């Protein structure tokens, strides 16, 4: 009856987007605007914007109506 975490599997119909915590490791974050200390203090990072942009770039690229 115990709960085991299962990741949410939603098809994106596109290329694989690198994980949120890996973007800085993979060099993506050097091509996005650096977050300000004000934005950082509130919990906003450039990683969020980069991840959202990559997900929207890859969303449904392989899909056909």
């Amino acid at each position: 009856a115990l709960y085991e975490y299962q990741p949410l599997q939603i098809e994106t119909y596109g290329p694989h987007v690198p994980e949120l915590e890996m973007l800085g490791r993979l060099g993506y974050l050097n091509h996005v605007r650096a977050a300000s200390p004000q934005d950082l203090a509130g919990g906003y990072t450039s990683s969020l914007a980069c991840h959202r942009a990559l997900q929207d770039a890859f969303s449904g690229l392989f899909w056909q109506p």
Partner: protein, 279 residues
């Protein structure tokens, strides 16, 4: 997200033939209703398309000179609203001039571009009495537009996918050393793609990628390796061929697009005012 959005599910159509079928059905239904209610006055579907192109350009011009500066997401949402509305409605039942302003109004509301009604209608080149009349018409048609959009208000534009593709190119495709100089041209093609029916036929990611690669080809840069290697399409040959044919079809749509002619626009405009006055 687009991959489970209403735009993908309900407003991305299989072919231009289906779009023409929808528009012709709208024209025929309006003609039938007018005949049942009680002639050369009626417009043909191609004339309706010419008028819709002209009024979409009018909507572009309205959103461009809007003050305060209107975000491009709001403009894209409004233009998509206009396209969707006149997919299933005749310009002789609802005037495109009012409908495009209602599309801009609803889009400003939906994309959280907080603007009050008086400063929305102050952008019109109209007298204050005319501005108030136009505001009343917009408030009357706002619910109608929302109903004709089937309450699908979130519109996925190609702009953010374009930015994400630029990020991915800067990160993972060193062969294209500076993707930034590909922007201005890829934007221009993007705008041309907006004038066609492609937004109702392709995904925003496909549209953005097609614009980027059209800019690359116009730059003499062959980056098919980005598709095959960086996007891992060398595994799925069929997927790569399908994507390449999608891009080719988009380029075909852009190359065969015909801007509306001014003389034809004026004639059809007189005809449309006649249709609205007679009714």
């Amino acid at each position: 997200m687009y991959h489970n959005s209403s735009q993908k599910r309900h407003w991305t159509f299989s072919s231009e033939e289906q779009l023409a079928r929808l528009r012709a059905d709208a024209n025929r239904k309006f003609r039938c209703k007018a005949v049942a209610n009680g002639d050369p006055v009626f417009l043909e579907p191609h004339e309706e398309m010419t008028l819709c192109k002209y009024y979409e350009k009018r909507l572009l011009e309205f959103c461009s000179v809007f003050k305060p500066a209107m975000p491009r997401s709001v403009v894209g949402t409004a233009c998509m609203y206009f396209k969707r509305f006149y997919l299933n409605n005749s310009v002789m039942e609802y005037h495109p001039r009012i409908i495009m302003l209602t599309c801009a109004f609803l889009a400003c509301k939906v994309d959280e571009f907080n603007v009050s009604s008086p400063q929305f209608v102050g952008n019109l080149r109209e007298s204050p009495l005319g501005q108030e009349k136009a505001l009343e018409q917009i408030l009357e048609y706002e619910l109608l537009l929302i109903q004709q959009l089937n309450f699908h208000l979130i519109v996925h534009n190609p702009y953010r996918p374009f930015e994400g593709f630029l990020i991915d190119l800067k990160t993972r495709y060193p062969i294209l050393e500076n993707p930034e100089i590909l922007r201005k041209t890829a934007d221009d093609f993007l705008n041309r793609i907006a004038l066609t029916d492609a937004y109702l036929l392709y995904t925003p990611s496909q549209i953005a990628l097609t614009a980027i690669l059209s800019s690359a080809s116009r730059a003499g840069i062959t980056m098919e390796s980005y598709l095959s290697e960086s996007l891992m399409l060398k595994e799925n040959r069929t997927c790569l061929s399908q994507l390449l044919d999608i891009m080719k079809s988009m380029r075909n749509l852009v190359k065969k697009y015909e801007p509306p002619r001014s003389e034809e626009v004026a004639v059809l405009k007189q005809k449309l005012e006649r249709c609205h006055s007679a009714e």
